[PDB]
Design goal:
With 269 residues, the chain is mostly helical. The chain is built from 15 helices and no strands. It has one domain. The chain binds the ligand C/C(=C\CC/C(C)=C/COP(=O)(O)OP(=O)(O)O)CCC=C(CF)CF. The PDB classes it as metal binding protein, lyase/inhibitor.
Length: 269
């Protein structure tokens, strides 16, 4: 029950998507370039971030690019948590300061994304987004340990929905009021966005997992509850005493960050 939306700048973003990974050594062969283009990652970013154009959308394209280039590095290493952690620690180190020039290319790529994500956002927003990233990397180490219901406790972090939502704020150049982000209602909405994404992904990944199909009814129930939660937002805004600008940022967060992450993956698949 959410509108499909796509950035008006999607064609330029898709045409230029290869320049960034090539300049950071993430794509070094023409076959790897073609394999990247066939995934439709700029198209996906233009649906997660329909409110972004120009360099803001380019940042979202790079994040999608980096996401699938990074997940690729775990199709034997992904079997041993010690080797997984050796790589995630080098990427996660970019959240704490400059990387050594010897860091692998996938790490310099993340650092370039993170450097652009933070500029112009409040320090508290950056600290909060940084811990979402650490949750994501820690989840990769947790699932590798499971290789050497309780599936959600790990998949909710490794699906990478929260950093995607985080970037929608940065791409829109707004911040949801931090006390509303921490609210029980907003957390429930974000939990639905995460659950819906990994459910649709485990359905699409059946050919190549939660099926190990009440999932379709589970998505419908969560989307119905998501609308219930959306209708609580006016009262939530008063409980936290939001002024006009804060109420407008919360509305921007509802439509351009949470709704887009729920709808965008569906229209992509
Ligand atoms: C919400 C996001 C994308 C939409 C849902 C998608 C494609 C999630 C990707 O799930 P994965 O199991 O890691 O790989 P797969 O495509 O299933 O072989 C951004 C995060 C993308 C990742 C790609 F791996 C997360 F690591």
């Amino acid at each position: 029950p959410l509108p499909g939306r796509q950035s008006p700048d999607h064609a330029r973003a898709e045409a230029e998507q290869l320049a960034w990974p090539r300049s950071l050594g993430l794509i070094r062969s023409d076959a790897a370039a073609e394999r990247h283009l066939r995934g439709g990652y700029a198209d996906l970013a233009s649906r997660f971030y329909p409110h972004a154009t120009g360099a803001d959308l380019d940042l979202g394209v790079d994040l999608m690019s980096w996401y699938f280039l990074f997940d690729d590095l775990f199709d034997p290493r992904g079997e041993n948590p010690e080797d997984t952690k050796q790589l995630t620690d080098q990427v996660a180190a970019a959240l704490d300061g400059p990387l050594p020039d010897t860091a692998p290319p996938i790490a310099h790529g993340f650092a370039d994304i993170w450097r652009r994500t933070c500029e112009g956002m409040t320090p508290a927003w950056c600290a909060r987004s940084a811990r979402h990233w650490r949750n994501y990397f820690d989840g990769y180490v947790d699932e590798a340990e499971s290789r050497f219901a309780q599936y959600l406790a790990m998949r909710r972090h490794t699906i990478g929905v929260q950093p995607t939502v985080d970037l929608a704020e940065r791409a829109g150049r707004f911040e949801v009021p931090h006390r509303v982000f921490d609210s029980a209602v907003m957390s429930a909405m974000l939990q639905i966005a995460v659950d819906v994404n990994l459910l649709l992904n485990d359905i699409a990944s059946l050919e190549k997992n939660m099926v190990m199909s009440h999932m379709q009814n589970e998505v419908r129930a969560r989307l119905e509850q998501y609308l219930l939660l959306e209708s609580c937002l006016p009262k939530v805004g008063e409980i936290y005493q939001l002024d006009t600008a804060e109420r407008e940022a919360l509305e921007r967060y509802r439509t351009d960050a949470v709704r887009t992450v729920i709808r965008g993956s569906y229209d992509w698949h």
